[model samples]
Target: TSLPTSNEYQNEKLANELKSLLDELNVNELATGSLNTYYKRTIKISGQKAMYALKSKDFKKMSEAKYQLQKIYNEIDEALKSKY
Candidate 1:
């Protein structure tokens, strides 16, 4: 089944929430793949709400979600840089 388009807000929320979850859970960025992969996966799963929002053409919401996802990705990169 596809995600609901009305869920754009929800998707953005979920993306932020996932970022927090990852932070809290201390999910490590293994040294196996490029950092981009890790960020992409995390952002994709986190912004799953986007599927629903897409149906509505909520470009604003989509943009926000993408921004949030990118933010999280940057954070991950920063964390990894600090670690290594």
Candidate 2:
């Protein structure tokens, strides 16, 4: 197994943060059950994609992949902000 690159590690951390926020929303009755579930899968796939992109040779591609995950994070954050 290869060691994680810095970008990959940051992506992993951000993805976990997003997942935890989603989990909190789920239990708090603030997010749609199906959409929250779907978002977690998106995080999983996009996070993995970012990791592989960084592992290979495309820093640009890795950044693009992180964008999707970040978008999901923003969406969840918006959901929370809209409530309060």
Candidate 3:
């Protein structure tokens, strides 16, 4: 796993960052609660595997994988984009 390293894109300055990332990566529409919940659960399971990868002693591979997931931090701008 490799992170998309760059000299340009780094952190988020705008609040819309998450709305934009999820808009791009999100597979299920939030309007459809069932599908959204189901899809998110699957994504959650996928994330569980990331911990193992991060813990792996293989520097090149593990570091690359960790870097990839680290990008998600750039998308998280707000504590919670609450609609409730």
Candidate 4:
């Protein structure tokens, strides 16, 4: 058997990294429908958001996204822990 503590640490860290990448591109990147039809649309939105934040520096959407992403990841991690 392997070390559960270390393995779980690695997984949770990976989850954090994944969250970062998702935030970079916009989390709708995960949706299949968006991938097919709205990929360009969403990418445009993500870019606009990025530019908006960088130039104007608004934290409202970022704050909302952070809260929702945290909630989602927390729920997913807890569910994974229970499953294993």
Q: Which candidate gets the maximum TM-score versus the true structure? A: 2
**Number of clashing residue pairs, candidate 2:** 0
Give me the overall lDDT of model 4.
0.45
lDDT, model 4, position 71: 51
Error of 3 at 7 (Å): 27
lDDT of each: 0.53, 0.57, 0.37, 0.45
Give the range of the ten consecutive residues with the poorest summed lDDT in model 3: 7-16
> Best by lDDT, which number?
2
For model 4, the superposed segments whose C-alpha errors exceed 4 Å read 1-57
Q: What's the TM for model 3?
A: 0.32
TM-score to true structure, per model: 0.40, 0.47, 0.32, 0.37
* Alpha carbon deviation, residue 75, candidate 4 (Å): 0.2
Q: Per-residue CA lDDT of candidate 3, range 52-81, in tens?
A: 543443334444433343353332322123
Q: After superposition, how far is residue 62 of candidate 4 from its true place, in Å?
A: 0.6
Q: Model 4, 18: alpha-carbon shift in Å?
A: 11
TM-score pick, better of 1 and 3: 1
lDDT (Cα, tens digit) per residue for candidate 4, span 10-76: 4454445434745645443444232335344534444444344333333454444444444544544
- What is the Cα-based lDDT of residue 43 in candidate 3? 41
- What TM-score does structure 4 among the candidates reach? 0.37
Q: For candidate 1, write residues 18-80 as lDDT tens digits.
A: 445444333433431446565657655655544444444555655544555556656776867
Taking all chains together, the TM-score of candidate 2 against the true structure is 0.47
Instruction: Please list the residue runs of candidate 3 whose C-alpha ends up more than 4 Å from where it truly belongs after superposition.
Output: 1-46, 78-84
Model 2, global lDDT: 0.57
- How far in Å is the alpha carbon of 31 misplaced in model 2? 11
